[model samples]
Target chain A: HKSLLKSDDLYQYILDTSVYPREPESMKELREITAKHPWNLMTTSADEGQFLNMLIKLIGAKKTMEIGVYTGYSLLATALALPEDGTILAMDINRENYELGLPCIEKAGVAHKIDFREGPALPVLDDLIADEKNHGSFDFVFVDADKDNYLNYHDRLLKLVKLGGLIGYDNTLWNGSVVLPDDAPMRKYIRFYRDFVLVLNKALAADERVEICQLPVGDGVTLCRRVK
Target chain B: KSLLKSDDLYQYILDTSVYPREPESMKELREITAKHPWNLMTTSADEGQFLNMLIKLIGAKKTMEIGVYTGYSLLATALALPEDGTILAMDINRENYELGLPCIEKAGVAHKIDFREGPALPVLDDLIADEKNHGSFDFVFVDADKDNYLNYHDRLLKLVKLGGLIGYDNTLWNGSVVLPDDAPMRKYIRFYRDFVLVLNKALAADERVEICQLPVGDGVTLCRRVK
Candidate 1:
């Protein structure tokens, strides 16, 4: 679990921190490139790559859906773990950001598996919902886009994903802002989404449709598996 | 302060979810642990989360949680498995166990746990004697009474199958093993501390399992037996 209590400004305070210590080489290389990006703070960390690798193998995931593809490190991670014919329905609002990392992803040689969609994700999700065959189709879905729109995505995603299929909600911890007092010093955007995140978390906990577990890996990921 | 700080979010989550609807603080007592400034006793959330997820990944239908303290780690295990997945949870005390049962039930994984109230050693002995139970458990978490950790290990190592895992909790024992004997220790804490040290030494020397001592909560030693 990645629990950093808002001392994020002290990003340099890597002193007390510990990683898996011995990461696989490709993962380590992938981390370096991802960490160098300006929005490195927005991406998942190395530990998560390790966990994702484990999860994909465990669930025997061949098909994946990812929203929010900044530099695509996690997308690359999912790509790397799966077998040759594995497929990912990768979507992003910004195509340039994905193109930025397309070189690394291609070099990693899992390029053919990804169906990159460059547009507003909502319409695509809506289209998928229109088709009954699309229901309960994905093995895993990684949600990491616009914070305000998570619940909206989840509503549509619930039907699009399979029974016993897993959905990972990234950045649910939102830099640990949920626990801060109302006056806590948060970035302007963080302040705006705080309430929504809190509401989403409460709703997830109360929802009996799935089993949930929130882990603090790379900004906190809440994993929910549909029970019904 | 340390306990409170660590407990803050974990306890809050447990209180709000799982057992509270039983919405009480039915968190897995096994997961409630304080990290020393050096983080000696506490397991990593990633490792615990990893184990929890892996338990599901492997489709562990029948499992057991050896130490059921306030219920943090146990919840991790519970969340990872299938809806029909079952966890036979054991702990020494009922009062504290019940404290988190509310959270576990609220989390709606209560049906997953078949909790046995008593010391773990004798119960483990009972299971060992019954051939019908042999190799039936897919996962075993060893986090109870440290003095019997080796005893637990000796049996668990046998009970757990080839690919099955036996997660030995708190192998770091507050980092006492690295410290000199003269290092300060509480009377009760000291009693189990030596056994912890011995158990660490033995685990290191053993060859049957491929081991890694993760710096997770209280230095968890994960033994994925290869032989």
Candidate 2:
């Protein structure tokens, strides 16, 4: 199935009826540009991008963090939703990929709001954890990179996110392979990552400090709200 | 095909993610509602959990729900909010609400609801007439009559507070939206499908609110008022 709806026709209806017309012009341009890239699938879908934008607006998120930055599709979505003075701490390992989208982000006039750091996210997370002021500071966090290290990120993020703050783990459903039969054929990368996703899902479900809702949107995004 | 997904994937998600976490009262209410002939109208477990989490996430205090089909969703919303939070629940038929009231009472959240019986439009008009009630509600859920969705939107836009949310339930009208001309559907489904299609187009273009139409349950289109 191309979508969680499991049918191309139904998914097309949603895009045509709800997503396309409402999409911001700059974001649409960025999406179209990213489609030519070899790793275009890493970019967030238009519908999910819209959801992220509305969610940021809904929560009044002033301070946010993004672990993965692929062509800045979701980054642009967040920047548009936030107020003029809002800040986003966006991290990614590849600067070249980000530079491709930076001009677009700047054209959108929200580039000054983002503090882009190019490196492994764990070290930066550690640096943030080292400072008492950074703890419980972020209003939202979207994790979409390095699935194997998700548990590591969560352990540190739980300290950084304030009570009532939300952390979204993208691709938690792993393209529906979490439920796939063990004997099913899969790509080398997908098989290698499936176990990690499974482990993370089970861990999140059992964790008591946060209440979670695993939604089937764009390969499944799990929203975790820190309650205690 | 079970649900719009055309498979039991929805049920699988519910079994694996939502149901295990659902409170006992909600599960009990769902089971009881399944026995009713109108059970198909009951809110899906995934959507119930989604609404609960959403209401709690926004810290909503004052809310309203139209269409209380055995109060499944009403109970879910109640459990997610603060103890002092209030819900102005209305339903055309009181008998169905009475069926689920005991479960709500048993859950000890009955004090949070002020149930009103009759057509919701007149009641909404009464609230709109009162100057104190304008733009005071945190959330409003419209799931009663598909034909009146446009009417509800017209009235609710003013009642719901700025930056507040209004969730329009079942805009997808069960996969009928994507069905080709040769496709067959129930009589009622076809009747309501046209209204849903019209509402979807209008809500997408409405400048007053930012919308996110989630394909969860029958298709819940959430409108977040910006103006």
Candidate 3:
């Protein structure tokens, strides 16, 4: 998928001038590997990965969670941003894709910080919610999977993330298709997920519990800082 | 100029995420600023909300803003800060600021601002002259003359506390930075494009800070001072 920016050149300029220069070597290696994958569109862009890394450090997030881990690009970015003691509870339905990037993550030497779980995230979130001790334990949560289930994940994540923590919802823009006419030509996956993304945006905006700022970085990432 | 793929997409973000969350005072200030001829210079509502969130996220108490076009962003910052928080706002024109002053005053955050109607360089120089003022600011937002951004950056790097943030606005120059040299551009945009390009390159190479250039409003390059 192309960038949500007005021009591809502008996006490339950002990548070349800032993101690529600052990108960690391990991340670059993993990014190149992920580019060859069939589902590369699902991977987080490098610019957004860099933004997430800064955000995690700015908020001093120690206990984090990522709902989707495609090729572990963003997961590696998060792990690198954290301190030695920081931990991430990462979940994805597939492990094969994850292992493809695991070697790079291990080489980066931050693999110890990640606790990868292979399965649907809902059951794990439900189990975590069931445990009283797990409530309000997370400092940050990044959701980039199953657009239709974002609201469900939101309800569960709110209970897990501590007050003042942030939950970033990725691909909220749906490749700028949110405002497209129904007849507009779009890829099957984009058109299919457009309504879900639209619904999620309105739901997130109306959600008074979190202060939301939707940033145009990689599709569109809405950073919801829990305030209520 | 919007950096988004389309105007509708930009408007979608404004209507969905920004407008619904915008404070009434900010909305009023925005409306007032729109009446001004140089309304284009005002920070976009989306960027205003982003700045407000950023200030709160970092808990910035001692902050500064170099450009104050009708105080739209100044109000955003003022409202985000604690009652005791301070902002040293500067701009060349006082009339434009006075236009939005009422909205800021009504919001009850006017007391937090110290508006200095003049060039910020002199004030910054004064602050830097005093050793005690060095590395004392929590955050500084620069949206003034593009040609002087590098100058402001050098001083800002000294004033902002270690780990503090300095946001340089209009670094993208309406996406003109990437345009071919022969491409036609508005006179002012063409003139300042070089400066914006130079600033971006300098910030990227500066090891004293970790930078993140976001496409949020023209373009804002956030430099977090590491040294």
Q: lDDT tens digits, residues B19-51, model 2?
A: 778889999899999999999989988899999
Cα lDDT tens digits for candidate 1, A19-97: 2343445556666776777877767666566556656765778989999988887888789878899999999988987
Clashing pairs in 2: none
The pairs that clash in candidate 3 are none
lDDT of 3 by residue, A1-228 (tens): 378899999999999998999999999999999999999978999999999988887777899999999799999999999999999999999999999999999999999999999999999999999999999999999998999899999999999999999999998998888998999999999898899999999999999999999999998999999988
Categorize the docking of model 2: medium
Query: How far off is each candidate at the interface, as Cα RMSD in Å?
Result: 6.9, 1.7, 0.6
lDDT of each: 0.70, 0.90, 0.93
Candidate 1 overall lDDT versus native: 0.70
Instruction: Give the winner by TM-score: 1 or 3.
Output: 3
Worst 10 residues of 1 chain B by lDDT: B18-27
DockQ-wise, the better of 1 and 2 is 2
For each candidate in turn, give its C-alpha RMSD to the true structure in angstroms.
6.9, 1.2, 1.1
The positional error of residue B118 in candidate 2, measured at the CA in angstroms, is 1.1
